[PDB]
Write a protein that binds this ligand. Structure first.
Ligand SMILES: O=C[C@@H](O)[C@@H](O)[C@@H](O)CO
Ligand SMILES: O=C[C@@H](O)[C@@H](O)[C@@H](O)CO
Ligand SMILES: O=C[C@@H](O)[C@@H](O)[C@@H](O)CO
Ligand SMILES: O=C[C@@H](O)[C@@H](O)[C@@H](O)CO
Ligand SMILES: OC[C@@H]1O[C@@H](O)[C@@H](O)[C@H]1O
Ligand SMILES: OC[C@@H]1O[C@@H](O)[C@@H](O)[C@H]1O
Ligand SMILES: OC[C@@H]1O[C@@H](O)[C@@H](O)[C@H]1O
Ligand SMILES: OC[C@@H]1O[C@@H](O)[C@@H](O)[C@H]1O
Ligand SMILES: OC[C@@H]1O[C@@H](O)[C@@H](O)[C@H]1O
Ligand SMILES: OC[C@@H]1O[C@@H](O)[C@@H](O)[C@H]1O
Ligand SMILES: OC[C@@H]1O[C@@H](O)[C@@H](O)[C@H]1O
Ligand SMILES: OC[C@@H]1O[C@@H](O)[C@@H](O)[C@H]1O
Ligand SMILES: OC[C@@H]1O[C@@H](O)[C@@H](O)[C@H]1O
Ligand SMILES: OC[C@@H]1O[C@@H](O)[C@@H](O)[C@H]1O
Ligand SMILES: OC[C@@H]1O[C@@H](O)[C@@H](O)[C@H]1O
Ligand SMILES: OC[C@@H]1O[C@@H](O)[C@@H](O)[C@H]1O
Ligand SMILES: O[C@@H]1[C@H](O)[C@@H](O)OC[C@@H]1O
Ligand SMILES: O[C@@H]1[C@H](O)[C@@H](O)OC[C@@H]1O
Ligand SMILES: O[C@@H]1[C@H](O)[C@@H](O)OC[C@@H]1O
Ligand SMILES: O[C@@H]1[C@H](O)[C@@H](O)OC[C@@H]1O
Ligand SMILES: [Co+2]
Ligand SMILES: [Co+2]
Ligand SMILES: [Co+2]
Ligand SMILES: [Co+2]
Lengths: 249, 249, 249, 249
């Protein structure tokens, strides 16, 4: 019974409804943005999320992302900035997470994110300490706030509870709150509360998103080194594979 | 009769109504964001915009900006990126321009912008060619699109028509359009059409905004060189002065 | 293969997503409003709409209705108005119709409706002539506008094409248009265009809705005669039955 | 210093900004709806509201109303309903009240209202007992809820505090709450809290609005008796006069 993919109908209903919800909330979703890469399922064992559906409230790692911008911002940069340009750029995405579902534990070496809740409430789990890079000095300025301890009773995905162990800091964001920054190199994950009557909708503004995915397999590289560059490190190895392509049957 | 400032009542009605409009459109406006620096008047001779008011449709250079984010994004950066970090960072602002009014001709040496129209329509004027920097190689990737010629009959601010001479390329953006990128070092300006029944509301996502203004006079500098760093070059000298502080009587 | 009901999962995903879309558009949807009567399927042979789903674009008669108000407005009425009070009252509902789907041909003897498109576009089909009531004088004031002829290529539900024969007048309504009135005793139906990227969402403001349905089976009758009073006359007999209760398996 | 009218500029800025706010909130505001009758000032001594402006927070009786529908709903009615048709009909309006301002104490003999808060919060004051009509039996069904006592510290308009004496019941409505019904013949008034950061925006759905005002002076009467029929009874005589026409200088 363990699902190994998502049917074309399950996929379209999930993604097209999400796109409509996005438009209702005034996010600029174009036709190209609504594709077979928008709906993400993090790992083969997470396809079981569609056993009972996106409204079951069950804890699984899957989400939708509509990307309206992923600008390298390389034009006009002095040549000397070429080796550090990968830490910059501008990316705008709308993220939709259903009740109980999660964006899994991971960190980026180059990308810094910010969250703006548009609908529902966002429960963020993260590590206030950066993931030290092997022998290399890093800049510091504000660091990350310690936050609060996890509330009791958070249901985690079966077979991936341990991937959340280090994301000890917690914060619950709501529409209207100040923008929340997630510095690069910091472990983070988030979910929509299981009792939510609406999907969690969040506007993410971050630096460039290096992701040689399926729908991202067809773009000239602004800088040589950027080609094939990956910047997503999932704590769970099971969440790495299926992140770059959803199995639609 | 030439106004030299804006009365406290004229200012508050302009800025508080704009903040409410922003909230209606779901932009996360906090209390701190609604201040005496949000309403901008570009030059002493532009205060005459309040002679007949923000609904006269007359061409003047004045606008409102609510900044929800201006993150240096320096944390986690390798030390070697310190000299180029100023070209990165993340800034999120909501801009409100009334009928006939303009955000004046200017360019940034370090900041790259992107526009998302939320309400009304945006008429952008710009130069598809970058403002060459004295003896220094720059990176290139996509450059700027040539766009279209200006439509006929655009009323420019009296005494500043020449500042628009070089911004020969034109594009009209609407809600739902793809995000529009304005690369750093490119001259640009924009206005709300004079016949618009609503103020132009635009979400701007850009790299860090270096602006030692009035409300920005009180923040630790992430990197030494950033202190007192200016990154706004207005074509009109008249628009430089009053950009950093609105005279409220 | 002919579906005879809708599964609990198909129902909830359809109705809960619709409720979320409604909230995003600012319609006041309460918990009680999201129930097993909100999703309507007009006839046993229309359950096949869930063969390929609400995003197939296929022509079927099914829709969702969230009722926020159905006030008799009997309080304060002079006793003499008791026999005509049934033509008054106030009803506020949000209607959601998916691509290609229809609200089937029908007329009301007592209820007058009005439409306000919130999202998408509404294609209304109707008869500009009232359905004459057996021997009884009726008041007239504005009547209904003749409208336009049907555009070519409208796909109707298989086995119910004839029910649309008399609804010869056509009008396409969009968000922002003047409110459109549908006088009582006039045949009407409507659909969401099959090529729409979003479900059609319409705010309906009408006089009292007399409907002894499933979720409506439990309310004191303001006036004696109102008890068990029906006011929905479907052109297709097949659309009458399943209108009062959706078969959820 | 006692203002006796509102300047053309004060009026337009108030009304045009309100119309834009309405559009942002998705209310279908057409060009005709934005006129010189939309902004209402209840009495000559209330023009002082523009002494310090709509953002002063001072208690004054003035508001804006955009009417999208006022349908007699007479078509299709049996002739015998002619004498009671005036209690029916359908009216849809968007009401905008600024901080501290009020819609003054009044009751309608024929019109029953309902409120839906779209933005901000609405503080309603009313009498749970109907205004008995001289020798005439009236129907009853749900009556009005007793509500709660007034919170302490409500600032009333100077020179009109007594008009509120009988409106002893209180209820505070917010966006998302169930629709609130105000039965005909019941005294009612409401205000936007003085500390609100946004104007109060409310969708009103009611039966026909009989109002021989300024912008309403030019429509055929559906039924003979309706001609010149008035249905607004203000507790304060000072609020009656200027209700039908705003003095714009
Ligand atoms: O935190 C989430 C961000 O990394 C998103 O843009 C995706 O990469 C999550 O997989
Ligand atoms: O183009 C406009 C941007 O530069 C804004 O953030 C302001 O700096 C305009 O003065
Ligand atoms: O035209 C549609 C209205 O009658 C709705 O309230 C429902 O009764 C449609 O079945
Ligand atoms: O309660 C307010 C309603 O009566 C409105 O439509 C206006 O008539 C208020 O003057
Ligand atoms: O609307 C675009 C279509 O819908 C999405 O499911 C994409 O797969 C694309 O095929
Ligand atoms: O909410 C949709 C349905 O109800 C829930 O119980 C899930 O199991 C799913 O099948
Ligand atoms: O131990 C300090 C750092 O913070 C935690 O997130 C760990 O991953 C480690 O990299
Ligand atoms: O709501 C905040 C106040 O309104 C704005 O006018 C700011 O000046 C601040 O004083
Ligand atoms: O729109 C507001 C008023 O009308 C316009 O004519 C301007 O002059 C201003 O005074
Ligand atoms: O002449 C090429 C460049 O483009 C234009 O914008 C000028 O400012 C110049 O700097
Ligand atoms: O959220 C309320 C639940 O969802 C809807 O499916 C209703 O059936 C009700 O059971
Ligand atoms: O849009 C969802 C899927 O795609 C359409 O082709 C329908 O058949 C349905 O199965
Ligand atoms: O024939 C005139 C009327 O208009 C049409 O709608 C028919 O139903 C009939 O009742
Ligand atoms: O936009 C319509 C104009 O604005 C409002 O002030 C009305 O008076 C009308 O003249
Ligand atoms: O909010 C606008 C200004 O500030 C308030 O104090 C009022 O007096 C008005 O003049
Ligand atoms: O005294 C009962 C009624 O209720 C109150 O509102 C009074 O106006 C009176 O008409
Ligand atoms: O123990 C809780 C959770 O299971 C873990 O992953 O993070 C810390 C939290 O308190
Ligand atoms: O001449 C027009 C305008 O006055 C100038 O500033 O830019 C080019 C345009 O065609
Ligand atoms: O023939 C078309 C349609 O099939 C019918 O039901 O109504 C009139 C229209 O022109
Ligand atoms: O006394 C308060 C108010 O002044 C009066 O008008 O209504 C009752 C309330 O408690
Ligand atoms: Co991330
Ligand atoms: Co700029
Ligand atoms: Co109907
Ligand atoms: Co009233």
């Amino acid at each position: 019974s363990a699902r190994t993919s998502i049917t074309r109908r399950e996929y379209d209903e999930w993604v097209r409804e999400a796109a409509a919800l996005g438009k209702a909330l005034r996010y600029p979703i174009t036709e190209k943005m609504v594709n077979d890469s928008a709906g993400i399922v993090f790992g083969a064992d997470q396809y079981d999320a569609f056993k009972n559906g996106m409204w079951s409230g069950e804890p699984y790692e899957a989400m939708i992302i509509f990307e309206s911008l992923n600008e390298p911002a390389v034009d006009g940069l002095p040549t000397g900035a070429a080796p550090y340009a990968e830490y910059s750029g501008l990316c705008d995405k709308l993220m939709i997470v259903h009740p109980g579902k999660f964006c899994p534990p991971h960190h980026h070496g180059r990308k810094t994110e910010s969250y703006e809740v548009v609908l529902g409430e966002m429960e963020v789990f993260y590590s206030p300490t950066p993931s030290a890079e092997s022998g290399v000095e890093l800049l510091n300025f504000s660091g990350m706030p310690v936050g609060s301890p996890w509330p009791e009773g958070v249901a985690l995905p079966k077979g991936r509870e341990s991937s959340y162990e280090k994301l000890t800091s917690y914060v619950r964001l709501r529409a209207g709150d100040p923008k929340f920054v997630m510095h690069r190199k910091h472990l983070h994950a988030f979910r929509c509360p299981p009792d939510s009557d609406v999907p969690l909708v969040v506007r993410q503004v971050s630096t460039y998103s290096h992701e040689p995915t399926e729908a991202a397999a067809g773009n000239h590289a602004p800088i040589p080194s950027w080609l094939g560059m990956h910047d997503n490190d999932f704590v769970s190895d099971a969440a790495n594979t299926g992140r770059l392509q959803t199995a639609i049957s």
